[PDB]
Amino acid sequence: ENMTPQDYIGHHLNNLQLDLRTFSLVDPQNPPATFWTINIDSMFFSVVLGLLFLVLFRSVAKKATSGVPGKFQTAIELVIGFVNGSVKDMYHGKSKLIAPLALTIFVWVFLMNLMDLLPIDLLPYIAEHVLGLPALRVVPSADVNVTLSMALGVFILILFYSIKMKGIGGFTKELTLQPFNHWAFIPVNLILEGVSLLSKPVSLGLRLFGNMYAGELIFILIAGLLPWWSQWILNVPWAIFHILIITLQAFIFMVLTIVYLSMASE
Amino acid sequence: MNLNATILGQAIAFVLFVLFAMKYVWPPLMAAIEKRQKEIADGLASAERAHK
Amino acid sequence: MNLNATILGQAIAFVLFVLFAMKYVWPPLMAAIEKRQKEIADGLASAERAHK
Amino acid sequence: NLNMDLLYMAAAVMMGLAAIGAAIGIGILGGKFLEGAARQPDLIPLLRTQFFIVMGLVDAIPMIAVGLGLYVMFAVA
Amino acid sequence: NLNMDLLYMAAAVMMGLAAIGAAIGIGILGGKFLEGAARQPDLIPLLRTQFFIVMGLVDAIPMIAVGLGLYVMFAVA
Amino acid sequence: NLNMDLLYMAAAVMMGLAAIGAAIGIGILGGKFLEGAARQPDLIPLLRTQFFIVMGLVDAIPMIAVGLGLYVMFAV
Amino acid sequence: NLNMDLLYMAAAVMMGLAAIGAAIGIGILGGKFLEGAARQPDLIPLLRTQFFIVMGLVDAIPMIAVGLGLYVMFAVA
Amino acid sequence: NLNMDLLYMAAAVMMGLAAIGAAIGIGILGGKFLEGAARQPDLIPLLRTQFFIVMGLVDAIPMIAVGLGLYVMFAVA
Amino acid sequence: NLNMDLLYMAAAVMMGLAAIGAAIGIGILGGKFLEGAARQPDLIPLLRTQFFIVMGLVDAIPMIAVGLGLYVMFAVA
Amino acid sequence: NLNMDLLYMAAAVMMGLAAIGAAIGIGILGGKFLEGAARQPDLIPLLRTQFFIVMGLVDAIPMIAVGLGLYVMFAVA
Amino acid sequence: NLNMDLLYMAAAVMMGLAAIGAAIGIGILGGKFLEGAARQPDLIPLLRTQFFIVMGLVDAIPMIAVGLGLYVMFAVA
Amino acid sequence: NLNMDLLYMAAAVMMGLAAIGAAIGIGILGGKFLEGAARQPDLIPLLRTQFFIVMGLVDAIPMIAVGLGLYVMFAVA
Amino acid sequence: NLNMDLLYMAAAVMMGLAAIGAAIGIGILGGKFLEGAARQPDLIPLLRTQFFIVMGLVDAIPMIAVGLGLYVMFAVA
Amino acid sequence: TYHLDVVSAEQQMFSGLVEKIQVTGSEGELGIYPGHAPLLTAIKPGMIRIVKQHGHEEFIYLSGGIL
């Protein structure tokens, strides 16, 4: 196989797309034009990891013993208390939705970032031959659609709450009389707050996305360029350091989401 | 990369995962906590009233 | 390049990773686990004294 | 052709400027956070909460710019 | 034609400068917010109110810049 | 023509340098405002008055520059 | 036609550096004004005079480059 | 080849800005961490903990930078 | 033509850098002057005198460049 | 011709930026370090112990760009 | 020869950097000078002397750049 | 020929960048040293020892950048 | 055409950047020196000895780059 | 208003509620309005101005001390 490193590093960027127009697999060499071409490879790991979350949670939640918690249960309600403490700190209101949303965000995104840690040609070398696939990029978060999917799934909630908890009234007030506070300056206030609000979610989506796209990118480069016998003396620092990146960048997702919503209402 | 209908396909699984965790995991695992805190309080109220 | 060589080179890195993690990243988190376990046990023992 | 000569400069400028801004701002903030902590431990957690509040506003425009850099480098270039 | 490659770089430069300015101009303000907090946490809510009230002003020109950058890079292309 | 697309470059430079100036100026001024308010939390409104004064002054040249930038973007 | 656009670029250098130098220069000065106000509010109207008096010197050179910038922009076509 | 010559500068701008940012940010942050440790040297380990917790946020856009720089300089080139 | 045009760019560069230099220097010096004033209000006249005596220097080289700007714009045009 | 020289320009920028970054970062960290000694001089060895760890972290991304500059100069010629 | 008005650019750059450097350096020095004076308002002569003593060295190098810029403008171009 | 008249620009930019880096870096460092001396002059020679320990480290990159800047101006041309 | 104008510009870059470095570095160092002196009117001579010692380590890369700019002009141009 | 206490080692020089005061600090002159955030400083010898509630201003002389 004439795999030149310039082209090997190229193929990994490809996606297992489905040409829902033809209910077909979009081949890497020619990319069909349309908005109707699901990236199946990440999307599927989405549900897979949400399942490994929910089953290990329900398999205690529905089975919870308040005695000396099992050495296993301990970690689960540990994270539970961590999350609830953070939420109670940065949110004060009555809405039930905030805390479970934050928990799901936090752990789900942690896992989605985690799956980068396995050697990146492992599943792509297996799935090619055991299944007959052209490509498989493992990290669900390294595609924008899912990250912006969640950013907009929280923008939905932002709008819901910003209209509910302060009606049209305070919503329109802040959208008209801020920052400059004078009525002649309402033309100034409008656009500014417009894209101010519209940037906050997008910056969330891209903060999650870019970090992981360029996480994967470093692994592709090392895995392709350097000779077998030394890819470790770099992949080691990079991987153990990226541990911290995945942790922080998920925790930050949770914090900023909670802060956006709590700020909107209160 | 290129925006895709995936943006909408994933919004489904997201919003629904939130509910199938909220309605059946969160209040339960907070119940297992609060129901123990209610007990941790009683021993202390005991000790103090018993000193009194 | 031969892909076989890149796969073996990756496996080297991944074992070198795990063998570090298992003496630098697992012990502390299970020590947090154990701390909270012990600190629940102590608040149980407290109530068992209080019911004297 | 001539497009691919420019496109990557038109990306790299964006991303290098975003890097300068993000790193400098986050350091200026984190320094005031740290030396505040070293005064009053057991104020650490509250200050860290507020630091994570404020960091989220720093990384907004730099991250928009990084997203567009990746757009240009792969949706175009 | 070579319109679009230069148009790309113009948005990249304007928005990179926007990103640097906004990142640093908010980092400074947040650093002072944190060092004001650490000396007396009990004023955290008032000072956070003031912090947002002010920072919404710093993010005036960089938002204009990002708007024009996206317009040029997509609407004018 | 080459005559049209360079002017977008000039406007971009005006916008970027005005953004830098305005953002850094208001950042510094706001930081000192915040600490001054943390010092005398009962004088907030008076300090905000005197803050808006110099905030107006500092955006003079940046608003002139944004004006000319939008000019070059649409007035030609 | 060929001659004109390059001079408009020269106006961007004039007024872009004047905005930066003018905004950040006074911004520093505006910082020490407010800080002084916080330590002695009963001098706030006195110092207000001293702020302007020195501010006149701050934007001296920026004002030159402003006046010329619109000259090179408009008058010289 | 023309692509390679133009690219071997596009990557240089990226990685130079990345280096400047990721050096100056960490310098500020480490300086504050050092003064903290000096004030109360029994606290060194906790301070190092929070230090790393912030260093990661600083070196994120700078690391995103390096990756694309190298990609350009050796994958497209 | 170009001998006429480009010298205006070459003047504009001088004028912009002189703007930044003079504005920043006078801003910092005026900041320390104001800070001294707020803390020693009875000495305001003495510090005012010293502020002029020293400002006279910072403003020298920038005003070399400022006049050379008009020279190259007009004395050669 | 252009083929062979532009890499020298690229190396010049790539390593000059890195030199600026490393110099400024290490200078700031060392300044705070020295002010650590000047206050609790018996603590010199402990501050020294911490300084070198932090100083290496400052020089982590500055030195990879320098190495790639060396590669570009001598690998690509 | 279309090169006459390009040496003018080299003088413009060299002397703009001269202005920047001299203005900012001596501005910082004068700031610290005034800050010392505010403490020891009787010792203004000693500090006001030492200020010249060191200012004479601060601007030494930019003065040369101004001289050489004039050389290029007049004695060459 | 351009290929070797322009190298002097590369060497120029490379060590010109290294000029400000090395100078500012040590100016930052010497300052903290001087104020440490002025508070506890009892410590001076021991402070001066610590100063040197890293004084060279700040000049890690600027020197090699200085060399590679010369090598070209004197061995490539 | 690509000889003289292309040399003077490189000399200008070199000496301008050395000007910035020397000016700002010695500015910072002299500011700290004046601060210490105003604090300690007794230590003027010891402090100024220390100042000159360290200034020798600030100035001696600008000396290099400025002399080299002269060599560019007087030994190439 | 806030409650001001001027006390020496020997006797109590002033008490009662005040609207503001201006003191000469070691670092520089000062001025304390109600709610002023915690502060600690020396003061130089010289006058101190008080405005007793309802604007009745009076000057006291202090030989030094700590604020």
Author numbering:
A (entry chain a): 4 to 269
B (entry chain X), C (entry chain Y): 1 to 52
D (entry chain J), E (entry chain M), G (entry chain S), H (entry chain L), I (entry chain N), J (entry chain Q), ...: 3 to 79
F (entry chain R): 3 to 78
N (entry chain H): 3 to 69
Give the published text.
A key component in the generation of cellular metabolic energy is the F1Fo ATP synthase, a biological rotary motor that converts the proton motive force (pmf) to adenosine tri-phosphate (ATP) in both oxidative phosphorylation and photophosphorylation. The enzyme is comprised of two rotary motors, termed F1 and Fo, that are coupled together by two stalks: a central “rotor” stalk and a peripheral “stator” stalk. The Fo motor spans the membrane and converts the potential energy from the pmf into mechanical rotation of the central rotor that, in turn, drives conformational changes in the catalytic F1 motor subunits to generate ATP from ADP and inorganic phosphate (Pi). Here we have used cryo-Electron Microscopy (cryo-EM) on detergent-solubilized cysteine free E. coli ATP synthase13 to probe its structure and understand its rotational dynamics and coupling.
Focused classification of rotational State 1 highlighted five sub-classes, here termed Sub-states 1A, 1B, 1C, 1D, and 1E; with resolutions of 3.1, 3.3, 3.1, 3.2, and 3.3 Å, respectively. The defining theme of these sub-states was flexing of the central and peripheral stalks, with the majority of the flexibility seen in the peripheral stalk which bends and twists, together with minor movements within the central stalk. Independently, the movements seen between Sub-states 1B-E do not facilitate rotation of the c10 ring and instead illustrate torsional flexing of the entire complex. Sub-state 1A was in one rotational sub-state (here termed Sub-state 1’), whereas Sub-states 1B-E were rotated by a single c subunit relative to Sub-state 1’ (here termed Sub-state 1”). In State 1 the un-stretched spring corresponds to an Fo rotation angle in-between two of its 10 preferred rotational sub-states. The maps presented here were generated from material imaged in the presence of 10 mM MgADP and all showed the enzyme in the “autoinhibited” state, with the C-terminal domain of the ε subunit (εCTD) in the “up” inhibited position interacting with the F1 catalytic subunits. In the cryo-EM maps of the intact F1Fo enzyme in the presence of 10 mM MgADP, all α subunits contained ATP and Mg2+, whereas the contents of the β subunits varied: β1 bound ADP, Mg2+ and Pi, β2 bound only ADP, and β3 bound ADP and Mg2+.
